[PDB]
């Protein structure tokens, strides 16, 4: 279910500085390219090792594409103050997400093209890659301008064409890399947390991708009662972390057992305190 996305953001802030434009591209949810109008030398930059295989011609051109995207966002950003009759005093955000999903047959599985203004859905190209969905009065105007302009039809091209032609190409150069993983390292920590009850916290660290499941089972019957969890979070080195806890009667801690499910494992982890 490989995929590629390009997250674009343009934020305008109170001041003399022209708005800032940032663009981040992904391949299977992995960042591989980036562009920040704030960089000393604005240019798209490699973000994945497998991208270093591309030559200058690739970067010069994409950076020129970013430059344009920037004016586009800049101009659009301007038009929005208009549709919304907003006072030229403050800051606003305009986001875009586009890209394409690739089926098993290397065929375009689906395309995406949607924008959000102030973090809320604005305009969006429907799955038929033919029609639009505007979210409020303002977007109706954009929608029309585009239907009349014949825009949908030109994004469809990209989604069905270039987005695919390259995504596969990228996957090609970075299959080894993208395909890699880092199993989790786990262990349980004891914790006072009561005078009769104790807290067991099963830790999973250094794993990648971020997907993972952690269970707590007392002789068979997995537990869900008094079980805590935490949003999976970045360690700051590429991998991720996560833990789950369960309230357990004292002098019984060793009865409960924790298991850790991850694709990196050749077999799920099974440990206790």
């Amino acid at each position: 279910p490989h995929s590629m996305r390009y997250f674009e953001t343009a934020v305008s802030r109170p001041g003399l500085e022209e708005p800032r434009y940032i663009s981040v591209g992904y391949v299977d949810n992995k960042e591989f390219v980036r562009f920040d109008s704030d960089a000393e030398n604005p240019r798209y930059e490699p973000r994945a090792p497998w991208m270093e295989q591309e030559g200058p011609e690739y970067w010069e051109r994409e950076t020129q594409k970013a430059k344009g995207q920037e004016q586009w966002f800049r101009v659009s950003l301007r038009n929005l103050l208009g549709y919304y009759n907003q006072s030229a005093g403050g800051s606003h955000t305009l986001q875009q997400m586009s890209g394409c999903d690739l089926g098993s047959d290397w065929r375009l599985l689906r395309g995406y093209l949607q924008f959000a203004y102030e973090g809320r859905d604005y305009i969006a190209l429907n799955e038929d890659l033919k029609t639009w969905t505007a979210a409020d009065m303002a977007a109706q105007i954009t929608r029309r301008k585009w239907e009349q302009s014949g825009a949908a039809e030109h994004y469809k091209a990209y989604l069905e064409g270039e987005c695919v032609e390259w995504l596969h190409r990228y996957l090609k150069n970075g299959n080894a890399t993208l395909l890699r993983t880092d199993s989790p390292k786990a262990h349980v920590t004891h914790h006072p947390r009561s005078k009769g009850e104790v807290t067991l916290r099963c830790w999973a660290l250094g794993f990648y991708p971020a997907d993972i499941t952690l269970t707590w089972q007392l002789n068979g019957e997995e537990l869900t009662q008094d079980m805590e969890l935490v949003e999976t979070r970045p360690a700051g080195d590429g991998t991720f972390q996560k833990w789950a806890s369960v309230v357990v009667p004292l002098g019984k801690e060793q009865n409960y057992t924790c298991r850790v499910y991850h694709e990196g494992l050749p077999e799920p982890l099974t440990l206790r305190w």
């Binding site: 390219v33 586009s98 305009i123 301008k145 302009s149 990209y158 270039e162 390259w166």
Partner: peptide
Amino acid sequence: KAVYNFATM
């Protein structure tokens, strides 16, 4: 490779 927007909003 990145999309290239067409008509502005």
